[model samples]
Target: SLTEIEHLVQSVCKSYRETCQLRLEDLLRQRSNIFSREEVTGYQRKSMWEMWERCAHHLTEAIQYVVEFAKRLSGFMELCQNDQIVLLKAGAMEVVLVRMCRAYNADNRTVFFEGKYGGMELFRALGCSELISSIFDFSHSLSALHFSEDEIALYTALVLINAHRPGLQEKRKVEQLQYNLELAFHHHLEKTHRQSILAKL
Candidate 1:
């Protein structure tokens, strides 16, 4: 059962990794031409690099978590009669999908706007959606998280992906950033049924 569950996790991860690498390679192919003509220039390039770094870092971290979570989930599956292993795997897949979306968004924005290919407002908007979808998925999983305090802390820390400077803002709606942030905080604090106020940070 554990082996089967691990395979499921690996399938999702491998699929995600392949697509991510393919898209990122395509973007990297035209990095130079984009840099030459772009007025936004350094900031956009830096943002792309930071996104890449973070995506890579998060993937490594997620792999480690998936292995550990699989072991723990297998133990739960054995102890509990319910098919929790499958449910856990589903949740894990959601995490991978959200990250995969982020990687794609980064690749798309990086290549299109800066390079000769040119960028569209629609592409940027879609990229923004990917970011929002990512946060929403995290909140959804948080609500389903069934674990103790320390474990929740470890899990939430990675999922939160908190950042302060030059935060993700929508194209035209500046207030949307604050609005989303407050909503996310509400979900983190109020919506997660299992977590106590004191238990979460």
Candidate 2:
């Protein structure tokens, strides 16, 4: 569950803050243009595409925080290995949470796809080859720089979610979705865990 992982991560961050006086926002500002809930106003913009672009542009920056935060709280990966089951469970939960968030937003027809690529047939025209290659470069660089169980779990979840095509059902049936979701998670969870394990070897 996100709540559990959040609590654990927050505890580590708090301890690191008290001991080293490190700040999260310092790393979060690497991109400089992104806005957090605490930073900007509510009436900032009314476009989903804009938000998507903003987020996609700064995706690496947001991920940097996760890595830096883990560094500050060292041994998280070792602990993850100690409790491999927990790692798997948390990994699944993280991806499930993201999937649910995306579904919820789409169902509500909120400001998600309103401004960005709604009219762009880039996926069909360009085939996402270039963009995917760039993302792989960015994501792989970060992964190699700081490959750990904590990160592997989270990143694996995100990648699997991104790969899966979502079914937008008017009736949200948990059982039908859980099978596909869990299958993807199960496949990637082991792969990521193996990679993390091999990183130590």
Candidate 3:
């Protein structure tokens, strides 16, 4: 039954996400992205480098989380080891980007970061304004969907178990796995009566 898949995903997403949230709260025991905005625009802080370091650290940590998620996915280990590596390389960043949206404040259009909630301008000194804005916009949009964690988890599972990634030695196996995830996804959404957001996602 699909309950087996649902149970596995529910457990995997919750257990991993719970720890991640607790860690974030501990690290960001501060806030007020606005006033800080005033101070930052006046003279860029020297810790831009440190902030960059922190950002890098988080992404690397996120990659580890994604790797853990890969291993825990049902039937994931049954795939060729090289294909497993390929899935992680292709899907980790995509998964992290989606996960990061959960921390975004759609109201303020700011991200919780480095002990504070800050708008995109908070990262101007990083010289990646374009990247930051795209992140903000995408997350803002994703947050708009207000999808449940189960939905996001399945979406993530679907993304990772993709059938089309190049260099897969056994594309058929991946395709087979993906179909079941897709089946579970459709069944989960079938009764909601929501007409169209699926395509947007």
Candidate 4:
């Protein structure tokens, strides 16, 4: 049942969240600080270089985490393996982006980095400040929601089960599975929005 799956999502994702949280921090604590002291404080070229390397590694790690989490969903594995991977290729980035809200704090407009926090200033040297601005804008907007892991897991599941993706052979079957998540997600949103309605009345 979807109830059991919801619990599975929460449990699996919670465990993933607790340990090996970020590659940058893990590297910092275990090995010598490969990033220089000056670089950590500024968004200089060297800092951007370091952040890119870490982010590339982190993206790779996050994709694996998404894959492991997706497999645990039970219904997804029932599809042909080709369909399964196509789902990953299509939606994993969306899932990973949403997952960032967990570490973000809109109040300070800061992001978790190298065992601490940094604002947009600490990330500007990444070449495209324009893109960085939009990234921060969206992440802040998401962070303002203060969504719990329950919602995160549910939304993550919904993002992954796309029926319309190109390589899917059983679009109907995939759509049917996503139907369960749709109801669950709407129910959750309604549960929260009920408060706003009640407050107005």
Candidate 5:
């Protein structure tokens, strides 16, 4: 049943979240210190460069966490190598942004870098305000939907299995997987709505 599969995906994502959060937290702690350091008067330019490098380092770690997550998905290994690569290529950026919801605080209009809160101005200076705003909006909407952890994991899986990439040799196969996942997500929504309507009655 879709419910069963959703629960399975949820469980996997929960465990993965726990493992990745530990590493992410450690990296973020280091990043917080980097940003907090008192400026060295003579080497301001060097300090700025180092800050960008540290930012890139943190982003690299986030991608590594996603790679580990891709490996943990139950049927990811069954796909052909080319298909797997195609899915990863198509979905990696989307997954990264979705994962960033963990750091987004919509009310404050800030995103956390490690433990530090940075406003839109900082992100704008980095030339990423557009992307950050879009991601923050996405998280906000997702929150309004009130999806459970299982549903969130299922959505992530659906994003990864998107079958529309240009070079996919097995588009049909990937589409089938996506179709199944979509049905599961829809089923969840229907069940939730039904429960709510019954409560009202």
Candidate 6:
């Protein structure tokens, strides 16, 4: 049963990763004008509102992905409906942040969101310094890991299925599942001489 669970997790992760990558690529391909200081006179306000709209749209799409991903996991679906919803609520933001890593430019302190590239200074002027900092910090850490597609899949799977979240119906079973996944992930790293980084993840 444990082995089967591991395989299920791996398979689900693979499918989710493929779909998410395609979606993100498609989003990136759909271009929008960069938000800039020069546009403050004419376009900044309009662009800012549009940016928020895009963020909302992107967030909606991200939530859908999470729901679909969870739905595909039989073990997850076996949980009580409220527990399932609780898991999604707890993990969706983290998952979205991981997805949005592609748009972050840490060196220049810029983020491309809602099809627009905006600098940290601009975001700070708009009163979002702390949020931007958190985004960049997460982006940098994730980037530093240099995760392969398979690794990303495993990581995201673990992110979604954490057992320690509040109000789970079968916390012990979920915890074991999480442990099994981590063990498998450790084995994966052991083969690549990268086991040292396991703690960081």
Clashing residue pairs, backbone N/CA/C < 3 A, model 5: none
The alpha-carbon deviation from the true structure for residue 168 of candidate 6, after best TM-score superposition, in angstroms, is: 1.4
RMSD of 3: 3.4
**How many Å off is the CA of 154 in candidate 5?**
1.3
Q: On residues 59-88, what C-alpha lDDT tens digit does candidate 3 reach at each position?
A: 888788777777777779899899998888
Q: Give lDDT for model 3.
A: 0.74
Q: Is candidate 2 or candidate 3 better by lDDT?
A: 3
Q: Residues 154-199, candidate 1, lDDT per residue (tens digit)? A: 3332332222313322222323322343343344444346346445
Q: Rate the local accuracy (lDDT) of all candidates.
A: 0.39, 0.35, 0.74, 0.69, 0.62, 0.68
Tens digits of lDDT, candidate 4, 36-121: 44655554655667778866786788788888878876588798988899999999988888876665667656666555666666
| TM-score, every prediction | 0.26, 0.24, 0.82, 0.74, 0.69, 0.75
Q: Over the stretch 108-131, how does candidate 5's per-residue lDDT look in tens digits?
A: 555666456554445333455587
lDDT of 6 by residue, 1-201 (tens): 556656755785666765673454554444345665675333345556665665568679877877787676546777878778888889878877776665665555566654566665554334466986877888877877766656766676688889989888889877876776676666666766877777786
Please report the candidate that would top TM-score against the real structure: 3
- List ranges where model 1 is wrong by over 4 Å: 1-44, 47-50, 73-88, 93-130, 133-201
User: How big is the positional error of residue 7 in model 1, measured in Å on the Cα after superposition?
Assistant: 29
Report residue 17 deviation for candidate 5 (angstroms): 3.5
Give the range where candidate 1 is weakest over 10 consecutive residues by summed lDDT.
73-82
Q: Look at candidate 1 and tell me the lDDT of residue 21.
A: 31
lDDT of 5: 0.62
Clashing residue pairs in candidate 1 (N, C-alpha, C atoms within 3 angstroms): 34-114, 34-115
Candidate 6: residue 105 Cα off by (Å):
3.3
Candidate 4 scores a C-alpha RMSD against the true structure in Å of 5.8
Per-residue error at 55 for model 5, in Å? 1.8
